[PDB]
């Protein structure tokens, strides 16, 4: 039983025995995590950053959209005047993917072609690291923001279907929760601010 | 003006003597459709489909149809205007069935001689009068020009739409004798969003107007300087116009000082004439008006978006089916191009007019419900619906009871 | 719909000495007390 | 081969060209399956609404068409002697369009099921279903745009 | 200053990308496996009290 | 060149930026959503308590400001020209981990207490000072994480 | 031969677009436009494909005049 | 959290049940129903609510209190069957477990009517159409409880509940059937409690645990207050009727099992805090109804929970009971006790 | 052997040639099993609808035919001295057609079960079932197209 | 650098300085959340016992204060040129105080919930709750003592 | 450094010195939490048995005292230039006392809960509870003895 925990425990035991054996020989520095970071191509880190950025942003957007859409469709059976009102709760989940688009358009202007000489220079390794971590920062922040705004949108659709006076008081919470994707946007623009192109 | 009124009334019934939003919608709705649907032949097929419904109006308003042909017939003038404006837009994109035109002389000139397989460049012997030049057709960097072209097109059109819809708020407040709303809401929002996002549009047009190679100056990046206007003020890498190190700081502090000048005057004038409800509602209006400047002007990238994807899917459909049947000499080639043109016309009428027209139609509708009518459209009122006599339709009334 | 229920009960009641047999009525048999069309069939059960 | 163009370079391009159509087919299959269960449960009572409710299945198939477009455009750029830059760009474009289409397919399936079951007993909910499904369709469209903008740079000034 | 003679950099880049794509394929198949049919709307029931 | 600033050093500082932003945003979103469910659950019976009941949502929005401050202070020290030893990268990663996990735990506590305290507030109006008191006790955990990240930031650049 | 009226328009309209579209594409094959044959790819000969595209336009014309008289009977 | 994976299947069901919930009658609507003079005024007043056009196409003169409660119950039952058809997985199971508790009552009613030689069709009506189970009218044959069980009850979903009921092996009368039915409902509540503990997610888990706790406690107090009639019952033969779930089992069902008079039950319930407010005052059933409606009201504050189905079911049943009581007081000219409806909203 | 054509190169081609027929057989088996349970539950009451409801099983078998086609076309291109480019292309084609056929088989199984059970009591739902099953069939068709376009480039100008 | 003082040496000190405040914050958050749910469920009926029952939340916050103390004292001993001995001592001190505070926070949360719910209806149980909570507090105190005794030896006669 | 005394040698000593107090704190926390829930459920009815039932919480705290003793005695033997023999002995002593205290804490918690709940209604069961809890206490005592006998050999004739 519990095949996933068996896989996790087996990977843990194999890693512990392998690292302990590389101690056992006296060659504990052959597991060299830093030399792996030098000798790996910076365009891999940059393109994983851009692709995982736009992918995680779209996943968070879709998540929020169907959470609020299922509840709004269900609550609009008796009160069909909630749809054009709580359209804005789907607007708030759709702008997350547009933030991911803006980040992808900014980052894709830095994917130039470098020379075989000074390929692994200081600026190129800096650019790969900055684009990778900035992309996954804004992508994970967009994912979490889309989930939260979708949950609050479903609850706002139910409360507005109760009576019309409640959606003004619950839409404020969506205004609170929608700033977090913009925080991720700002810090993703700021992490890759001083990174140059690939030259 | 009936179908566009039914469009705008689906969102909300306007306040008494407020400016109707169904009057500019008549032309601003099919044009924002047309930017996303920029094809000559697809707008031509859409006009033919519309004229099949407009040319017999008297025959159709006496039949019982059901829920699909109803939306087809009550919006026939919408489809007619969408098709005609899509003809104009697809003419300006130089795109008919994902092909070019060659109706003027080009502004680019190819070299004199080349071997079969040499990568060459063109030499810019003038400018092309109406539309994109037909010397961008194959060219293996056509997207590199077209994307930066149409993105700036979408940003400029979205800003002109927002700043035109915002003046209806001034024409409202001047009509209801509401002079505190002008000084408390119109001027702060006008200064805040013009001094940030119309300055970007002025910089886009100014970067278009200046020759950078002849002057020997490096062309700056407008996205880079828009980011560095807020995230590192004062520092400029490439210069655009002479005294811009101070104009950035001035516009930044003016957009800053419009934040405490908003959320302050409209409540504290009610105080000296606070309450809590006006104060909290004005804080919500400030935190909602701001952060919708950025979000709403980012939302106009859909005009670029659907245009690029419609062009690419139509190009792949042309090169996938009917392009195969052009090198097939014999009696088999006749039936091959017959069957492959039948497949191509069925696909370009099914998935590429009907299924991408509905999308861009309700995108032009989202751009008016959210981004455009959040700036002048107040909201709630009670519809007219007088007492009148009607036919009653018995079997509806039996289903209404049971 | 009830032939399997009949034979289940009559197998549990006749203890295993049932000689149930059924043939189908092809056309539906229209009901008056309800409005279901009610595919029916015949049956016969032998005992002493 | 060369330090800029090693021998393991077409692996990333082949993985991207596969993964585009793979993840868009998974998203389209989830959308088609969930919406089809909703249609078959709904249209026992209203068989006249059968061809009206077919919209979420079509909007799920458009995602697989997006993945097919990106897979063909990546596939016509593979080569034996390409660089790592081209393979990384092709892998990023494939992952972009694939996972965006997967998320859009999940949203289209869930919203289409709920919308068909709700619009069986409320005729005004069909246009709201179409609006929410269009908001679910532009996510895969955004993934398609990012994939095309990556693929347009895969072979510019590569040595 | 090579990393390894058998665990080279190309092999590790290929394995890291393959592990990411296998992870997302496994997740999406776990989404597909939880997928039910709601058989109650596909049956009929008489209930002669009704 | 320098054995103290090798070129793999920025990876850990950018990892610190990423952790400090993402996990603080996660804690703020958990607190905001979990409290807003209770705030709109009480909204049908007594809608006059919603405008006072927005204490746990404003309270769990400060945690994203904590992560914002620490992320921009870490990202201000990174540059493709400076020296930037490995010690500075280990310190930046420890800053990010401190702020991220402290704000995650604090946001979880704010979400739990705010949900149950707002749902059980429609009965007893004297229960409010206890709500605000326990929320103040839940808020200070992210503050402790931000204090140790400020000290690690001013320690690491030496 | 049951009804054969709702499928008459589907073929007459298809043929009416097909004649015009393949006629103008064949005319653009004939005079070498340098956008249909202006590269090293798909056609090379010129009017040798204009030949069979005009043939297909003629075949669409006889589709059109066949199915256009069957719809006339209603 | 709870709002993450819930909506994937249950978001539409939750929204529709909240929409059903918004049509519960509030206090002003019950006062407007109280102010009606004749019964046609009650029909016209109910027409402007969520009920409306439900007594349309009946009559203007065949209007009776029994007809009104029949149609007001049938609307409830059709809405429940719709929500049960639109579900799958664990929610479908959960609603089948809601149905089984009425199946038990139909078993006891059919056996009891079979003892007194009544008609099949008389007992087939007034037999609660939600707990149907197709082989139900076959319970009118073969009086002996074994010859029911080895023939028809093993193929029903009530088969694992007779593990105690085979102690007496004779023909049944009115007290044996009630001892049987109490053992059924005991085993039933413990099956459904162990179902909720292991599969239902957490915010619905705690709400269903406290609602099942109240169901068990109400039936324990009812069995303890009905068992002191004219018989001799061993505390070993009575403690097999009180369920092992609730907030009064760990030690307070013990003093209920060992009790002779009414004061013994008062001293047994004297230490449980929520109780001992009940026996020193008037209608002892209205306190259980009021506390059930307060618990069901507290169940509607959780949003991502399928406790909403159970809470709405019980609230709508109380609503039908209130409209039946008001219709009786209107039709019989007995306006002195018309304000004894139970309204919490 | 050679730096362009190493010795481990036919491993990826053999894995692709296996994985095509493996994952299409899993998809076809799920579709056949789910639809057959639906048919055997339905046709106790209507045995006259038995040969009418056989359509989802056939549309599940077409997916296994797709996998068989791609496995034969990959298998007739293996060699001892091929490049890594050819093995990567063959592995990508196999994964494409296999996982597309797996997703299409899951969708065909679920939609066919629901459609047969619904069309037992509504005769107008059969054509809607056929429409949704055709939308589930084109996904495996798209995977087949991407696999053929990859396989057509496996041996063009490879040295 | 040196064989006694390598370059990877401040990693263990930074991990210990982080992990102290991380695991003590998790323990304090569990204690505060569980005890606060207990207080909010209890004090609907007896709002006069609201400020009397606040004790488990304070005893949960003292654990986070312990973690803050150890994190500051470790943080003022980091350096670029320290030994592995110092980093191992700092990592051990951080793990000690962190996991001891986590266990103490779990115990304080569970005992505080049960004690508040029990003392709502028995006024003599409050002092027994305080006794058991003090026995749960000394565990984090023991972790603090072991961390201080480790940290006092991190820089004695290290070369 | 030296082949007998490498540089990674204090890592095992620091891990043992941490793990002693960590696992004894987890065992003591489980015992205190389970027994405290039992006391708070019992002493609503008999508040006079409150200070009589406090014994399992004290016998759980003695385990944390054992872990504190072993952690202090290991901590005063760390050094920069120690051998691998000393680090292995310290790691073994820490694991011994920690996991023995964890097992003893689980047993004390479960037996104390059952014994308090049983002795609420049977006054002669309290001495049987004390006997079984003493049998659960000697397990952690045995772990303490094995840890002390290991630690007494960590520095005898080590070069």
UniProtKB/Swiss-Prot annotation, chain B:
Effect of residue 310 to A/E/Y: Reduces ATPase activity
Domain of life, source organism: Eukaryota
Vacuolar side: 38-39, 101-148, 208-250, 312-332
Annotated consequence of substituting residue 369 to R: Reduces assembly of V-ATPase complexes
Post-translation changes: Glycosylated.
Positions of transmembrane segments: 19-37, 40-56, 71-100, 149-168, 187-207, 251-270, 287-311, 333-371
Ranges of the Cytoplasmic topological domain: 57-70, 169-186, 372-402
Cystine bridges: none
Protein location: Vacuole membrane
Subunit structure: V-ATPase is a heteromultimeric enzyme composed of a peripheral catalytic V1 complex (components A to H) attached to an integral membrane V0 proton pore complex (components: a, c, c', c'', d, e, f and VOA1).
Summary of the function given for this chain in its UniProt record: Subunit of the V0 complex of vacuolar(H+)-ATPase (V-ATPase), a multisubunit enzyme composed of a peripheral complex (V1) that hydrolyzes ATP and a membrane integral complex (V0) that translocates protons. V-ATPase is responsible for acidifying and maintaining the pH of intracellular compartments. Is present only in vacuolar V-ATPase complexes; enzymes containing this subunit have a 4-fold higher ratio of proton transport to ATP hydrolysis than complexes containing the Golgi/endosomal isoform and undergo reversible dissociation of V1 and V0 in response to glucose depletion.
Family: Belongs to the V-ATPase 116 kDa subunit family.
Note: Present with 55714 molecules/cell in log phase SD medium.
UniProt protein name: V-type proton ATPase subunit a, vacuolar isoform
Residues of the full protein shown: 387 to 835 of 840
From Swiss-Prot, chains D, I, J, K:
InterPro entries linked to this entry: ATPase_proteolipid_c-like_dom, ATPase_proteolipid_csu, ATPase_proteolipid_su_C_euk, F/V-ATP_Csub_sf
Pfam families named in the record: ATP-synt_C
Tagged with keyword Ion transport: yes
One of the record's GO cellular component terms: proton-transporting V-type ATPase complex
Recorded topology in the membrane: Multi-pass membrane protein
Highest taxon of the lineage: Eukaryota
CDD domains to which the protein is assigned, alphabetical: ATP-synt_Vo_c_ATP6C_rpt1, ATP-synt_Vo_c_ATP6C_rpt2
Annotated site residues (Essential for proton translocation) in this chain: 137
TM segment ranges: 9-31, 54-74, 91-112, 125-150
Chain's role: Proton-conducting pore forming subunit of the V0 complex of vacuolar(H+)-ATPase (V-ATPase), a multisubunit enzyme composed of a peripheral complex (V1) that hydrolyzes ATP and a membrane integral complex (V0) that translocates protons. V-ATPase is responsible for acidifying and maintaining the pH of intracellular compartments.
PANTHER family per UniProt: V-TYPE PROTON ATPASE PROTEOLIPID SUBUNIT (PTHR10263)
Protein's name according to its UniProt entry: V-type proton ATPase subunit c
Swiss-Prot record, chain E:
UniProt feature coiled coil, ranges: none
Membrane-side (Cytoplasmic) residue stretches: 33-50
Superkingdom of origin: Eukaryota
Localization (cell): Vacuole membrane; Endoplasmic reticulum membrane
Transmembrane segments: 12-32
Mutant phenotype after disruption: Reduces association of VMA6 with the V-type proton ATPase. Decreases VPH1 protein level.
Function: Accessory component of the V0 complex of vacuolar(H+)-ATPase (V-ATPase), a multisubunit enzyme composed of a peripheral complex (V1) that hydrolyzes ATP and a membrane integral complex (V0) that translocates protons. V-ATPase is responsible for acidifying and maintaining the pH of intracellular compartments. Functions with VMA21 in assembly of the V0 complex.
Family to which this protein belongs: Belongs to the VOA1 family.
Assembly notes: V-ATPase is a heteromultimeric enzyme composed of a peripheral catalytic V1 complex (components A to H) attached to an integral membrane V0 proton pore complex (components: a, c, c', c'', d, e, f and VOA1). Interacts with VMA21. Associates with the assembling V0 complex.
Any further remark recorded for this protein: Present with 12764 molecules/cell in log phase SD medium.
Name this protein carries in UniProt: V0 assembly protein 1
Species name: Saccharomyces cerevisiae (strain ATCC 204508 / S288c) (Baker's yeast)
Residues of the full protein shown: 213 to 262 of 265
Curated annotation (Swiss-Prot), chain G:
Transmembrane regions: 9-29, 53-73
Sorted UniProt keywords: Endoplasmic reticulum, Membrane, Transmembrane, Transmembrane helix, Vacuole
Protein's cellular compartments: Endoplasmic reticulum membrane; Vacuole membrane
Domain of life: Eukaryota
Single biological process term from Gene Ontology: proton transmembrane transport
Entry GO CC: endoplasmic reticulum membrane; fungal-type vacuole membrane; Golgi membrane; proton-transporting V-type ATPase complex; vacuolar proton-transporting V-type ATPase complex; vacuolar proton-transporting V-type ATPase, V0 domain
Membrane side Lumenal: residue ranges: 1-8
Cytoplasmic topological intervals: 30-52
Membrane topology category: Multi-pass membrane protein
Main location: endoplasmic reticulum
GO MF, any single term: RNA endonuclease activity
Quaternary structure and interacting proteins, as annotated: V-ATPase is a heteromultimeric enzyme composed of a peripheral catalytic V1 complex (components A to H) attached to an integral membrane V0 proton pore complex (components: a, c, c', c'', d, e, f and VOA1).
Task of the protein: Accessory component of the V0 complex of vacuolar(H+)-ATPase (V-ATPase), a multisubunit enzyme composed of a peripheral complex (V1) that hydrolyzes ATP and a membrane integral complex (V0) that translocates protons. V-ATPase is responsible for acidifying and maintaining the pH of intracellular compartments.
Name of the protein this chain belongs to: V-type proton ATPase subunit f
């Amino acid at each position: 039983f519990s095949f996933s925990h068996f896989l996790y425990y087996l990977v843990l035991i194999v890693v512990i025995v392998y690292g302990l054996y590389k101690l056992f020989t006296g060659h504990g520095s052959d597991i060299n995590f830093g030399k792996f970071l030098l000798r790996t191509s910076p365009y891999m880190w940059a393109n994983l950053g851009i692709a995982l950025c736009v992918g995680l942003s779209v996943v968070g957007a879709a998540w929020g959209i169907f959470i609020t859409g299922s509840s709004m469709i269900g609550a609009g059976v008796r009160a069909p005047r909630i749809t054009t009102k709580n359209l804005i709760s789907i607007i708030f989940c759709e702008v997350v993917a547009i933030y991911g688009l803006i980040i992808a358009i900014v980052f894709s202007s830095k994917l130039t072609v470098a020379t075989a000489e000074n390929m692994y220079s200081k600026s190129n390794l800096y650019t790969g690291y900055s684009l990778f971590w900035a992309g996954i920062t804004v992508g994970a922040s967009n994912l979490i923001c889309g989930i939260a705004v979708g949950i609050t949108g479903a609850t706002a659709a139910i409360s507005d279907a109760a009576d019309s006076a409640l959606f003004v008081k619950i839409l404020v919470i969506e205004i609170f929760g929608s700033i977090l994707g913009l925080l991720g946007l700002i810090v993703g623009l700021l992490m890759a601010g001083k990174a140059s192109e690939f030259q | 003006t009936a179908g566009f009124q039914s469009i705008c009334d689906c969102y909300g019934i306007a306040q008494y003597r407020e400016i109707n939003a169904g009057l500019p919608t008549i032309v601003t709705f099919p044009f924002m459709f047309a930017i996303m649907f920029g094809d000559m032949g697809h707008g031509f097929l859409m006009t033919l489909a519309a004229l099949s419904l407009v040319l017999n109006e008297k025959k159709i308003n006496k039949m019982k149809r059901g829920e699909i042909f109803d939306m087809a017939f009550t919006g026939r003038y919408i489809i007619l205007l969408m098709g005609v404006f899509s003809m104009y837009t697809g003419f300006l994109y130089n795109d008919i069935f994902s092909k070019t035109m060659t109706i003027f002389k080009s502004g680019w000139k190819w070299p004199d001689h080349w071997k079969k397989g040499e990568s060459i460049t063109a030499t810019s012997v003038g400018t092309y009068p109406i539309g994109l030049d037909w010397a961008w057709h194959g060219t293996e960097n056509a997207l590199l020009f077209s994307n930066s072209y149409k993105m700036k097109l979408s940003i400029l059109m979205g800003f002109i739409h927002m700043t035109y819809s915002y003046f209806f708020s001034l024409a409202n407040h001047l009509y209801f004798n509401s002079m505190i709303d002008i000084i408390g809401n119109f001027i702060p929002g006008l200064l805040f969003m013009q001094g940030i996002f119309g300055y970007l549009s002025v910089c886009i047009v100014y970067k278009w107007a200046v020759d950078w190679v002849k002057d020997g100056k490096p062309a700056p990046g407008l996205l880079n300087m828009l980011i560095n206007m807020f995230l590192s003020p004062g520092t400029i890498d490439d210069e655009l116009y002479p005294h811009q190190a101070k104009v950035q700081v001035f516009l930044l502090l003016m957009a800053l000082v419009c934040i405490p000048w908003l959320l302050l005057v409209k409540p504290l004038h009610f105080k000296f004439t606070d309450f809590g409800d006006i104060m909290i509602h004005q804080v919500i209006h400030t935190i909602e008006f701001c952060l919708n400047c950025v979000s709403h002007t980012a939302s106009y990238l859909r005009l670029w978006a659907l245009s690029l994807a419609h062009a690419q899917l139509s190009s792949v459909l042309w090169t996938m089916t009917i392009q195969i049947a052009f090198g097939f000499r014999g009696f088999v080639g006749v039936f091959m191009t017959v069957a492959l043109f039948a497949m191509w016309f069925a696909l370009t009428c099914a998935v590429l007019v009907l299924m991408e027209g509905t999308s861009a139609m309700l995108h032009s509708l989202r751009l008016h419900w959210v981004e455009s009518m959040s700036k002048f459209f107040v909201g709630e009122g009670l519809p007219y619906e007088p007492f009148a006599f009607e036919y009653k339709d018995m079997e509806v009334a039996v289903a209404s009871a049971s | 719909d009830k032939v399997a229920t009949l034979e289940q009960i009559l197998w549990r009641v006749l203890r295993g000495n049932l000689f149930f047999k059924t043939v189908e009525i092809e056309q539906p048999v229209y009901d008056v007390k309800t409005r279901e069309y009610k595919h029916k069939n015949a049956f016969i059960v032998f005992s002493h | 081969m060369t330090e800029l163009c090693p021998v393991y370079a077409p692996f990333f391009g082949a993985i991207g060209c596969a993964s585009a159509i793979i993840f868009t087919s998974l998203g389209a299959a989830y959308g088609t399956a969930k919406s089809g269960v909703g249609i078959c449960a709904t249209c026992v009572l209203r068989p006249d609404l059968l061809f009206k409710n077919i919209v979420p299945v079509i909007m799920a198939g458009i995602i697989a068409i997006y993945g097919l477009v990106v897979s063909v455009l990546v596939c016509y750029s593979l080569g034996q002697k390409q660089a790592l830059y081209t393979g990384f760009i092709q892998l990023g474009a494939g992952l972009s369009v694939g996972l965006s289409g997967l998320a859009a397919g999940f949203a289209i399936g869930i919203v289409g099921d709920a919308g068909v079951r709700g619009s069986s007993q409320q005729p005004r909910l069909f246009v709201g279903m179409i609006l929410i499904l269009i908001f679910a369709e532009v996510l895969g469209l955004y993934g398609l745009i990012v994939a095309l903008l990556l693929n347009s740079r895969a072979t510019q000034d590569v040595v | 200053d090579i990393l390894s003679s058998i665990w080279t950099e190309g092999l590790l880049m290929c394995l890291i990308v393959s592990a990411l794509l296998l992870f997302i394929l496994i997740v999406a198949l776990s989404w597909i496996s939880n997928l039910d049919i709601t058989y109650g709307a596909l049956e009929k029931s008489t209930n002669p009290i009704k | 060149s320098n054995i103290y600033a090798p070129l793999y050093a920025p990876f850990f500082g950018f990892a610190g930026c990423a952790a400090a932003m993402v996990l603080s945003c996660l804690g703020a979103a958990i607190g905001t959503a979990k409290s807003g469910i209770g705030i709109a659950g009480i909204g049908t019976f007594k809608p006059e308590l919603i405008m006072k009941s927005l204490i746990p949502v404003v309270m769990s929005g400060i945690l994203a400001i904590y992560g914002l401050v620490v992320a921009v202070l870490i990202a201000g020290n990174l540059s493709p020209t400076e020296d930037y030893t490995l010690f500075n990268g280990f310190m930046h990663l420890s800053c990010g981990l401190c702020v991220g996990f402290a704000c995650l735990s604090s946001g979880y506590a704010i979400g739990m207490v705010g949900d149950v305290g707002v749902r059980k507030y429609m009965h007893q109006p004297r229960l409010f000072v206890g709500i605000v008191l326990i929320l103040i006790f839940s808020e200070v955990l992210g503050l402790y994480g931000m204090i140790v990240a400020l000290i690690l930031n001013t320690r690491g650049s030496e | 031969p049951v009804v054969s009226t709702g499928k008459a328009w589907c073929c007459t309209v298809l043929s009416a677009f097909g004649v015009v579209i393949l006629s103008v594409i064949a005319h653009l094959f004939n005079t070498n436009h340098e956008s249909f044959v202006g590269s090293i790819n798909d056609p090379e000969d010129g009017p040798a494909v204009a030949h069979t595209v005009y043939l297909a336009a003629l075949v669409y014309l006889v589709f059109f005049v066949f199915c256009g008289f069957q719809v006339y009977l209603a | 959290m709870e709002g993450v994976y819930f909506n994937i299947d249950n978001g539409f069901i939750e929204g529709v049940v909240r929409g059903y919930r918004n049509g519960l009658l509030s206090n002003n609507q019950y006062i407007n129903l109280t102010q009606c003079d004749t019964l046609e005024d009650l029909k016209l007043q109910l027409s402007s609510t969520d009920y409306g056009n439900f007594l349309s196409s009946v009559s203007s003169e065949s209007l009776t209190t029994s007809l009104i409660q029949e149609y007001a119950s049938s609307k409830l039952y059709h809405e429940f069957n719709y929500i049960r058809d639109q579900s799958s997985g664990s929610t479908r199971k959960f609603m089948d477990y809601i149905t089984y508790g009425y199946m038990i009552d139909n078993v006891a009613l059919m056996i009891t009517g079979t003892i007194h030689d009544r008609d099949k069709g008389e007992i087939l009506q007034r037999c609660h159409p939600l707990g149907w189970f197709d082989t139900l009218p076959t319970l009118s044959v073969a009086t002996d409880l074994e010859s029911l069980y080895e023939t028809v009850l093993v193929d029903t979903p009530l088969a694992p509940y007779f593990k105690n009921c085979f102690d007496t092996a004779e023909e049944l009368d009115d007290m044996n059937i009630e001892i049987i039915r109490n053992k059924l409902y005991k085993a039933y509540l413990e099956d459904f409690y162990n179902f909720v503990t292991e599969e239902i997610p957490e915010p619905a888990k705690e709400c269903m645990q406290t609602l099942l706790g109240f169901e068990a406690d109400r039936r324990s107090i009812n069995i303890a207050l009905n068992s002191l009639q004219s018989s001799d019952i061993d505390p070993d033969l009575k403690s097999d009727l009180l369920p092992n779930i609730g907030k009064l089992y760990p030690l307070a069902t013990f003093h209920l099992a060992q009790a002779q008079d009414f004061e013994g039950v008062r001293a047994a319930l004297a230490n449980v805090y929520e109780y001992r407010g009940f026996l020193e005052t008037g209608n002892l059933e209205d306190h259980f109804y009021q506390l059930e409606m307060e618990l069901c009201r507290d169940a509607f504050t959780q949003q991502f929970a399928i406790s909403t189905v159970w809470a709405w079911m019980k609230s709508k049943e109380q609503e039908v009971r209130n409209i039946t009581w008001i219709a009786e007081c209107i039709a019989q000219n007995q306006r002195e006790r018309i304000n004894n409806y139970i309204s919490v909203y």
